[PDB]
């Protein structure tokens, strides 16, 4: 059989993984609730590189209109979860 059903917890661990592999983000001060522009001091192009990293992570593409608003890791977790039909 194929891959086991995704669990929100594995999702969120993975998003945090890619986020601390990003050079412009402080690992010891990044949280699941950290705003990208406001708390971490990034601009729109950093946020675009971040969504592209997330699609490279989870192997599925995110539409531009929807992404414009994924401004914290929790929002990315919620988007991926509601897209791939994970409740827990």
């Amino acid at each position: 059989s194929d891959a086991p059903p995704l669990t929100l917890e594995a999702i969120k661990d993975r998003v945090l993984y890619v986020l601390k592999l990003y050079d412009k983000i402080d690992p010891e001060k990044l949280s699941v609730n950290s705003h990208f522009m406001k708390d971490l001091g990034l601009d729109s192009l950093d946020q675009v590189e971040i969504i592209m990293a997330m699609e490279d992570e989870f192997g599925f593409e995110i539409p531009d209109i929807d992404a414009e608003k994924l401004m914290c890791p929790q929002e990315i977790v919620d988007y991926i979860a509601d897209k791939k039909d994970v409740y827990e």
């Binding site: 522009m37 729109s44 414009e68 608003k69 401004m71 929002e75 919620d78 509601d82 039909d85 409740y87």
Partner: protein
């Protein structure tokens, strides 16, 4: 940039509802409540069909002219016929360029 308050609140409410629905699509431990020899394959799938076909060809199809035609068998110099006991002479003493 980002969601508006109403957008985020509605996404949260829809998310809770959707996750409850997906949770309730699960089956309970009893859900499908259903109401109330080693060589057997080679004999019914190979042996029986070849009995019917060989019977059909031997006594029905070959009971009429020109239904099963086999190209006549090759004959070579030095061969011996089975019916007549003929012998076809061999072939003219090759120049033997050994």
């Amino acid at each position: 940039s980002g969601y508006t308050p109403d957008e985020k609140l509605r996404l949260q409410q829809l998310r809770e509802l959707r996750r409850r629905w997906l949770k309730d699509q699960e089956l309970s431990p009893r859900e499908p409540v259903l109401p109330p020899r080693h060589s057997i394959f080679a004999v019914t799938h190979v042996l029986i069909p070849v009995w019917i076909i060989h019977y059909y060809l031997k006594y029905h199809v070959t009971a009429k002219p020109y239904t099963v035609v086999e190209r006549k068998p090759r004959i070579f110099p030095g061969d011996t016929i089975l019916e007549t006991g003929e012998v076809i002479p061999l072939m003219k003493e090759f120049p033997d360029q050994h």
